[PDB]
Design a protein around this ligand. Structure first.
Ligand SMILES: [Mg+2]
Ligand SMILES: [Mg+2]
Length: 1209
RNA sequence: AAUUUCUACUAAGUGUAGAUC
């Protein structure tokens, strides 16, 4: 009988690496320099990039051994089934499986033969690179035994040969890029054949381009395989584009000839598309500038492609609107906005057309119907200009409005060129430095942006076809030009990364000290081989590295008593008992030293001790006892570890025994070694010594330590059985300094420094010593990464999701933490009990820190506000944008802690937005990409949640962290449920009356006067109430469309309260309700004491009554009201009364402590996100224990409104 | 404006609060 969290400790193992600074002690650094130990590791760091290029060389020769040798069998059917003019009906589906097998055939041809094995293993730079193609053999030699360097590279490069359908894959480049273009050129070649003079075709082209083959050949389908390799690609593209001839001659390609057939001026005869060949900036101001000048000046090719695209689109009318497509996705919203004037128009017209087909007059639109229709829209690949014009009202030519938009964008590039013109002068020199030159950086960004946006907008004109009749006459010119234009993407990114860079560098290189096996392990004596160990003196820890000539130097050292002793590390990790107990104890040396029995041998060889229905408990137990006894009689192990074994009988399986061996097969304590003696070893350079350090080891550190500091100390604390452990794979790095100390910004001693937190009541600080910006980057820095194992031997095994459900099922009053992102609040929190009562509500705009019993807050929302003003003053430059992103990422590391306390405090489950059902809205300040990061870190922390201020052995302290979450997988996997975390859709959580569950499901925009009458008439009643001085609209959501989700159906709307209206004016004004009705009715001669006035109201003859009656109605249903300037109120008022008679205003809760209902609209959202989890909990309470794992949690809008409206009481 | 590293700091004077492969 305890808390639900109590059950979640020692569940699964987790591994982490702690980093530290390593401070060289004494003469160590001098010795390191004299003996020149470092430079070995530093040049390798230099030539790493060089060797990588040589690896790419052999890779490219390889790719071209497999590609010369390949004949695609799948191909010949594929081409046919491709240009079959589809005819669809999923007959094409047959083909889309033929496609995948084209990539399948390529991948397997790589893997299948001519080696491929020896490619990403140690033997590629050992021997293979040396035998392939002196100044290059030398660099590779030379990395022998240091093959570690290329592992990240090795992973990045094996993705080349997959069937992955990624732009990484060679196969994808072959079939889904080159082959569609190769096919599309056949059909161009067939159509455009006779244009070619015999003297033009094979004459100049066959001889000068080849003298082998003929031009006809490369437009035959069986010839494609020839064009997989780069030569055949160059040959092909030279046929199209042209060729230099090796003399000045310059042979025209096919495209020039088609061009020269402008003589018929009908023209618009399609040109061929070239084939994709396959397989920046950033180091200096002079480089960055050289690229900008070179790629973006007015006779660059990017600027050439812009002029061609200007010419192309100027003739947009000349082309067939039926054969021009716009890719489906964001480009559809945008172009809808630019063409018609609204986002959802295209989507809306398309929904109007889908309905008519799928909407049976039995009707009632349901959630699934809307989900399925949505799945259909998304699935649609693209829209022709013709189809878009099909939605085009009269008066509005879609092509022409598009022309004026595109042309406009090119004119904006040309004006921006004019403003940047001096930058492209041969004469131009950079006076200041780039990161000191805001003006230049802004000139560059302006131009880059205007071209990037042009590029990014024009990209929409494909539709990934895979499409029927395309206007190849348009897509010839377009594709020629756009492939060039696209180069701006790379340039943009590189230049931006360079400006955005920190003024310092974190570049570093791994240290082996001329030792391939340096520091592989710790725990055991292999210390003569690994040559690194760990020393302790008082509170300080040290890393000690023995010189090769003196490995044993640490061996022989007295226990002293001259009053000076480092403590010295030893003892032992027994690694993987399950592999290692049988490898030792069945080794013939042991099978001599011991007998053993043949009953034991037979059990092992057959494996009657494992699982898998050959299991025999007694056979298993015999093995155990054999091992147990073998353990008594094996010195190496029984003088190392203190084995305390469970009775053999209470072992159910063999893993039970193995865990105990693993658990006890690790010791760790300390030896004793003369301080004076090793200190001298350092002096003589027999030993190199570094202090392992972070600021928490400073003699002036008095605060609560870093979490990782605790982990590290706890490694060697008596109270740690239980358990954090030290692991091998430690690495030492060198980080060369990147700032010069004399050049740092400094706050000089004895002068007040302004304090920056406006909520810090102390205004200045005066210290008696100097404070330096970024000081740590002005010194060469050694850094030490040490791997640790947490909960290596878990006792509690179970499924975390199932256990959470079971405990919630049997919890009589489970609390839920709701988190929501808000408009006036970065994050807002609502804690709720098992019945929906709010227990705690507040904004997380302010993070309050504790040190002593002193509290100081930081308002991160004001920070973001000052930085957004900064971004405005700086004209949205890159660096402010990065500053805002990082601020937010900082903020979320603060929030993670606030959530952990709340979980611990209320034993509560967490309710979070599912971001894969993504909506989002411009007003919320934490965007999706930051929130996703937040949700990942929340998960990461809940793998091992720890409160730093708890005593470490206590549950929830550093040796007993809560594990209430499984390991992160991906963002797509952040849905449904991860342990204590539940992912909820935000649908209908903010705009809903938390006291009745009323949500506005009507559509109140004026459309027509008939529609308005129908609307008014669909109401049950409209009656002015004299007693309560109110108008009462009584409705039945049945008589209105798309209201299926509502549960109560019958709702009496009233007037009381007022509302804030946009009133887009000469954009804010406010409006009292029940007095706006009185006004309007008087205005039109309608006496309203006469109710039911529905019939009456419909007697009105002009739009003006109706247009303003509807606008009035919309406001009554507008529950959320906000001024935007004033932080005071973003309130919620509801047009419907509860069972006790008065209705809900937010301002009546707006100032209290933790009210019973939400205080503003931000709260309501976090409150309702939490209630959906209560709903989910409610489903658990309905299921049997063994069914819990199966219960669905994806609440539907209909379940939600039923719950919101019935549970309130 | 100090950091294993990050963000926000100065937090009582070479650092503070979270977080951190
Ligand atoms: Mg600290
Ligand atoms: Mg900083």
């Amino acid at each position: 009988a305890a808390s639900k969290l109590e059950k979640f400790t020692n569940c699964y193992s987790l591994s982490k690496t702690l980093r530290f600074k390593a401070i060289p002690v004494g003469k160590t650094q001098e010795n390191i320099d004299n003996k020149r130990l470092l430079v070995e590791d530093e040049k390798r760091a230099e030539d790493y990039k060089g060797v990588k290029k040589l690896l790419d060389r052999y890779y490219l020769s390889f790719i071209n051994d497999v590609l010369h040798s390949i004949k695609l069998k799948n191909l010949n059917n594929y081409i046919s089934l491709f240009r079959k003019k589809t005819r669809t009906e999923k007959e094409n589906k047959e083909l889309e499986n033929l496609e995948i097998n084209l990539r399948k055939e390529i991948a397997k041809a790589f893997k299948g033969a001519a080696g491929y094995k020896s490619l990403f293993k140690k033997d590629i730079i050992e021997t293979i690179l040396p035998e392939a193609a002196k100044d290059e053999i030398a660099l590779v030699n030379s990395f022998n035994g240091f093959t570690t360097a290329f592992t990240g590279f090795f992973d990045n490069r094996e993705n080349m040969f997959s069937e992955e359908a990624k732009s990484t894959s060679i196969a994808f480049r072959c079939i889904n890029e080159n082959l569609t273009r190769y096919i599309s050129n056949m059909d161009i070649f067939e159509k455009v054949d006779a244009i070619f003079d015999k003297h033009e075709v094979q004459e100049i082209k066959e001889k000068i381009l080849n003298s082998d083959y003929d031009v006809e050949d490369f437009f035959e389908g069986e010839f494609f395989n020839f064009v997989l390799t780069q030569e055949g690609i160059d040959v092909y593209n030279a046929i199209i584009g042209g060729f230099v001839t090796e003399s000045g001659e310059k042979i025209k390609g096919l495209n020039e000839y088609i061009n020269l057939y402008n003589a018929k001026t009908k023209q618009a005869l399609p040109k061929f598309k070239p084939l994709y060949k396959q397989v920046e900036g950033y180091t200096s101001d002079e480089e960055v500038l050289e690229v900008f000048r070179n790629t973006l000046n007015k006779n660059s090719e990017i600027f050439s492609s812009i002029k061609k695209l200007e010419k192309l689109f100027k003739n947009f009318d000349e082309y067939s609107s039926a054969g021009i497509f716009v890719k489906n996705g964001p480009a559809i919203s945008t172009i809808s906005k630019d063409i018609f004037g609204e986002w959802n128009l295209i989507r809306d017209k398309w929904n109007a057309e889908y309905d008519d087909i799928h909407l049976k007059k039995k009707a009632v639109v349901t959630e699934k119907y809307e989900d399925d229709r949505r799945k259909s829209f998304k699935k649609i690949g693209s829209f022709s200009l013709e189809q878009l014009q099909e939605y085009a009202d009269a008066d509005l030519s879609v092509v022409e409005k598009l022309k004026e938009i595109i042309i406009q964008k090119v004119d904006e590039i040309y004006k921006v060129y004019g403003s940047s013109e001096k930058l492209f002068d041969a004469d131009f020199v950079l006076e200041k430095s780039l990161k000191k030159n805001d003006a230049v950086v802004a000139i560059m960004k302006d131009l880059l942006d205007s071209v990037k946006s042009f590029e990014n907008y024009i990209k929409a004109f494909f539709g990934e076809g895979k499409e029927t009749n395309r206007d190849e006459s348009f897509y010839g010119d377009f594709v020629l030009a756009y492939d060039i234009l696209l180069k701006v993407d790379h340039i943009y990114d590189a230049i931006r990364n360079y400006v955005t860079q920190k003024p310092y560098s974190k570049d570093k290189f791994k240290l082996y000290f001329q030792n391939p096996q340096f520091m592989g392990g710790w725990d055991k004596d292999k210390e003569t081989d690994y040559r690194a160990t760990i020393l302790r003196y008082g509170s300080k820890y040290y890393l000690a590295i023995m010189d090769k000539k003196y490995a044993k130097c640490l061996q022989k050292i007295d226990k002293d008593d001259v009053n000076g002793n480092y403590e010295k590390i030893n003892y032992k990790l027994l690694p993987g008992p399950n592999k290692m107990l049988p490898k030792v104890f069945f080794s013939k040396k042991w099978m001599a030293y011991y007998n053993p029995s043949e009953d034991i041998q037979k059990i092992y060889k057959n494996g009657t001790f494992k699982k898998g229905d050959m299991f025999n408990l007694n056979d298993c137990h015999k093995l155990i006892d054999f091992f147990k006894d073998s353990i008594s009689r094996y010195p190496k192990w029984s003088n190392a570890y203190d084995f305390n074994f469970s009775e053999t009988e209470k072992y159910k399986d063999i893993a039970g025994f193995y865990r105990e061996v693993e658990e006890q097969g690790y010791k760790v304590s300390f030896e004793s070694a003369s301080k004076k003696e090793v200190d001298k070893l350092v002096e003589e350079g027999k030993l190199y010594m570094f202090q392992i350090y972070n600021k928490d080891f400073s003699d002036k550190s008095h605060g609560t330590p870093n979490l990782h500091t605790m982990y590290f100390k706890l490694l060697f604390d008596e109270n740690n059985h239980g358990q954090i452990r030290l692991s091998g794979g430690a690495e030492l790095f060198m980080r060369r300094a990147s700032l010069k100390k004399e050049e740092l910004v400094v706050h000089p001693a004895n002068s007040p420094i302004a304090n920056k937190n406006p909520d810090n009541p102390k205004k200045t600080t005066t210290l008696s010593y100097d404070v330096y910006k970024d000081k740590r980057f002005s010194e060469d820095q050694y850094e030490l990464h040490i791997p640790i194992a947490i909960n290596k031997c878990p006792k509690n095994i179970f499924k975390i999701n199932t256990e959470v459900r079971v405990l919630l099922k049997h919890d009589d009053n489970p609390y839920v933490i709701g988190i929501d992102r808000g408009e006036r609040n970065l994050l807002y929190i609502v804690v709720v009990d098992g019945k929906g009562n709010i227990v705690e509500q507040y904004s997380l705009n302010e993070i309050i820190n504790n040190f002593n019993g002193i509290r100081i807050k930081t308002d991160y929302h004001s920070l973001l506000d000052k930085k957004e003003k900064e971004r405005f003053e700086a004209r949205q430059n890159w660096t402010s944008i990065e500053n805002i992103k990082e601020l937010k990422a900082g903020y979320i590391s603060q929030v993670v802690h606030k959530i952990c306390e709340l979980v611990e405090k209320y034993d509560a489950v967490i309710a979070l937005e599912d971001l894969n059902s993504g909506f989002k809205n411009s007003r919320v300040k934490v965007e999706k990409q930051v929130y996703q990061k937040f949700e990942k870190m929340l998960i990461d922390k809940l793998n091992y949640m720890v409160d730093k201020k708890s005593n470490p052995c206590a549950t929830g302290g550093a040796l007993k962290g809560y594990q209430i979450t499984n390991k992160f997988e991906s963002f797509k996997s952040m849905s449904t449920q991860n342990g204590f975390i539940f992912y909820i859709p935000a649908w209908l959580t903010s705009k809903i009356d938390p006291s009745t569950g009323f949500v506005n499901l009507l559509k109140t925009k004026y459309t027509s006067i008939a529609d308005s009458k129908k609307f008014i008439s669909s109401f049950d009643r409209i009656m002015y109430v004299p007693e309560e001085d109110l108008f009462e609209f009584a409705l039945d959501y049945k008589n209105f469309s798309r209201t299926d989700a509502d549960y109560i159906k019958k709702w009496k709307l009233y007037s009381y309260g007022n509302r804030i209206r946009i009133f887009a004016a000469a954009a804010w004004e406010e409006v009292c309700l029940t007095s706006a009705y009185k006004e309007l009715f008087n205005k039109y001669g309608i006496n309203y004491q006469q109710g039911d006035i529905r019939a009456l109201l419909c007697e009105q003859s002009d739009k003006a009554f109706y247009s303003s009656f509807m606008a009035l109605m919309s406001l009554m249903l507008q529950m959320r009201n906000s001024i935007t300037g004033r932080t005071d109120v973003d309130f919620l008022i509801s047009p419907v009364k509860n069972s006790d008679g008065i209705f809900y205003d937010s301002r009546n809760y707006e100032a209290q402590e933790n009210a019973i209902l939400p205080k503003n609209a931000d709260a309501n959202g976090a409150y309702n996100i939490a209630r959906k989890v209560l709903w989910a909990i409610g489903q658990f309470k309905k299921a049997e224990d063994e069914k819990l794992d199966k219960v669905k949690i994806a609440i539907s809008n209909k379940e939600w409104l039923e719950y919101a409206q019935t549970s309130v009481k």
